[PDB]
């Protein structure tokens, strides 16, 4: 092919093809090994639907509730976009729990794969933070009272309790400053950290392969 | 289907197999059998189920926040129920917080405590399997009890 | 009753999963029969 | 709030998945002798 030769002599794309076509799937792998990939699919649906709603949502105490209602009743197919974002958030957590059961019951965490387990625990903590921050964006009765309770937990610590509370709230009490910081975590910070730790998770797996038979 | 043999005679493969690796060198070819034909089937099914639930069970709007009025009954998301039950039933602030933090911390030491045994099958790990089953029962017992009055925590209204 | 509804749905999910796997082996059996004819 | 359909799905897929993982492991154990 004329097109193929043009790229081959400049970037050596043939090396990539050879790497992909040199992998095999051993016969002890069954359908339960699909659970890790299904969790990734749910996360990609969150990115597509979450980005769409950033074109209509306003993060202020005066406009947050009204803007969410505008999406559900006025925007084209807005009812569908919001509903998918909420159902797909619960399915992501459910599929991750079943992934952990498969890993533990096949002994896939043992040597030399300890660091793959460790990076997985971090991804679990980041996913939980996604739910809490997004739970309060509507600024309704259920969302408002959850933020106040969660942000007050660190107070029990003897020395670093009180100063840590003000960093989360941005003040001594819940208000506009709290909503501004939670929106930044949900749409900028957490997405960035998740991408970094997913890359570490996948690089280790590809370098070592899948664990052996039972 | 189509399969490939290990070819044990290769010195390189034997070196990897002794270290717990090399299991992506035999079996069925990955391309196009799995990546190009089967993975799309799984992706289509996942999306279709999410879309089906969204149409049949849309989301509710709610009510604007009121700082002076707390709802009579308020709950977190379903996957916070076990820790939520711990706070209600433990009348001590500091103790309750420490137990919550020990869930992710305890889960982080699993690989460094079971390395003494080198088997993978759960039927060759009697002690590890027993601990796992007990933890699963306890977590479900606390989760169901978070939707009931505190006086029924220890019985769930059964006995 | 909320408890009754939740338990009813939980039982149906178990049934759907078993039926899905069984129908998978029926297709494999049909394929084998045609493989010789 | 209480979600009838969401809670029913969670409590249905956990026990069935655990049973499948134990059945496959047992078959490999018997043939390993």
């Amino acid at each position: 092919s004329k097109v193929y030769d043009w790229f081959e002599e400049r970037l050596e794309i043939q090396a990539i093809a050879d790497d992909i076509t040199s992998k095999y799937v051993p016969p002890h792998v069954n359908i339960f090994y699909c659970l890790g990939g299904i969790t990734l699919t749910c996360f990609l649906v969150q990115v597509a639907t979450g980005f769409a709603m950033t074109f209509y949502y306003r993060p202020t105490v005066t406009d947050a509730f009204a803007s969410v209602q505008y999406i559900m009743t006025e925007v084209n197919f807005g009812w569908l976009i919001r509903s998918v974002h909420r159902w797909s958030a619960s399915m992501m957590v459910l599929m991750m729990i079943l992934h952990v059961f498969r890993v533990y019951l096949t002994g896939g965490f043992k040597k030399p794969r300890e660091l793959t387990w460790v990076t997985g625990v971090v991804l679990g903590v980041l996913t939980a933070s996604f739910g809490v921050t997004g739970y309060s964006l509507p600024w309704d009765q259920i969302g408002y009272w959850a933020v106040k309770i969660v942000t007050g937990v660190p107070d029990a610590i003897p020395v670093i309790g009180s100063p840590l509370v003000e960093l989360l709230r941005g003040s001594a009490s819940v208000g506009q400053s709290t909503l501004t910081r939670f929106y930044s975590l949900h749409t900028f910070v957490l997405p960035l950290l998740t991408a970094v730790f997913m890359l570490m998770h996948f690089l280790m797996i590809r370098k070592q392969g899948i664990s052996g038979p039972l | 289907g189509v399969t490939k043999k290990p070819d044990l005679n290769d010195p390189v493969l034997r070196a990897k197999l002794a270290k717990g690796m090399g299991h992506n060198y035999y079996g069925e070819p990955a391309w196009p059998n799995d990546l190009l034909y089967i993975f799309p089937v799984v992706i289509l099914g996942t999306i279709a189920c999410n879309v089906g639930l969204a149409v049949l069970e849309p989301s509710m709007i709610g009510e604007p926040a009121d700082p002076f009025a707390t709802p009579l009954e308020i709950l977190p998301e379903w996957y916070f129920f076990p820790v939520f039950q711990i706070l209600r039933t433990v009348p001590n602030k500091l103790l309750g917080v420490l137990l919550m933090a020990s869930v992710p911390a305890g889960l982080l030491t699993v690989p460094f405590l079971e390395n003494v045994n080198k088997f993978q099958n759960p039927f060759r790990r009697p002690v590890a399997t027993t601990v796992f089953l007990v933890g699963t029962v306890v977590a479900l017992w606390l989760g169901i009890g978070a939707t009931l009055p505190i006086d029924k925590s220890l019985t769930l209204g059964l006995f | 009753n909320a408890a009754a509804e939740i338990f009813r749905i939980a039982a149906v999910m178990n049934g759907l999963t078993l039926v899905g796997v069984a129908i998978g082996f029926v297709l494999l059996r049909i394929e084998a029969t045609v493989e010789e004819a | 709030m209480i979600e009838v359909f969401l809670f029913g799905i969670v409590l249905g897929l956990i026990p069935i998945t655990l049973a499948g993982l134990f059945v496959t492991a047992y078959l490999q154990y018997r043939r390993g002798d």
Binding site: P26, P213, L214 | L17, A18 | - | T24
Partner: peptide, 26 residues
């Protein structure tokens, strides 16, 4: 031949190593 034997083969492939083989355990 036996129907039960046919089911066992499909549930788990018979062309796999086993944890007790000396090549892997050694």
């Amino acid at each position: 031949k036996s129907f039960v034997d046919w089911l066992l083969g499909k549930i788990t492939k018979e062309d796999q190593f086993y944890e007790t083989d000396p090549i892997l355990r050694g």
